[PDB]
Design a protein around this ligand. Sequence first.
Ligand SMILES: O[C@@H]1[C@@H](O)[C@H](O[C@@H]2CO[C@@H](O[C@@H]3CO[C@@H](O)[C@H](O)[C@H]3O)[C@H](O)[C@H]2O)OC[C@H]1O
Length: 189
Amino acid sequence: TIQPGTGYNNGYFYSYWNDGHGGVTYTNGPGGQFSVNWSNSGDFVGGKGWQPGTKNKVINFSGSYNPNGNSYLSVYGWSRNPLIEYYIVENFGTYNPSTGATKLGEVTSDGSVYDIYRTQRVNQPSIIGTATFYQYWSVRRNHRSSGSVNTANHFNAWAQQGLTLGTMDYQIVAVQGYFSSGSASITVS
Ligand SMILES: O[C@@H]1[C@@H](O)[C@H](O[C@@H]2CO[C@@H](O[C@@H]3CO[C@@H](O)[C@H](O)[C@H]3O)[C@H](O)[C@H]2O)OC[C@H]1O
């Protein structure tokens, strides 16, 4: 397993962040593979990808994802100027992260319709420190743990709806969890 932090592993950028609560282990495997095992964890986010990401990347992911409680499997990343945290959610556990969020449209991509939403984080942690910033979401209706994500279809739909992205920071396939349990093994390319 590895310490929380960022870096490169077998050619892929990785980010593993947690709240220090314990109960979660993250491991970097060969190529674009990573595994997450958690049991009564706290808040955490980890996965592999790129730094920086691009606005036209076709991301391939494959493996298993078995959450028991609150967790998401997503293409996840950020932009700067404006600061935006974004998600293309392929699967989740007990909580749909768009619950209560205002719907801003639909986009069809890679075999499913996705619902689009915008939320706001107020004085929360970010890649640039504590801040208030928006979050963009595409939530897949047809849940899966393998597939291909044509990021451009999402970024373009978001733009069309008034959700613009700044300069890309990291872009990864991530397993996020919030006080839950589970296991996942994902390969990115
Ligand atoms: O040391 C700093 C890092 O901690 C920082 O990392 C990012 C912090 O925000 C993370 O995003 C939130 C983590 O908490 C969850 O509950 C929220 O849902 C996520 O929005 C992000 O994943 C980290 O990369 O980056 C800057 C460093 O200086």
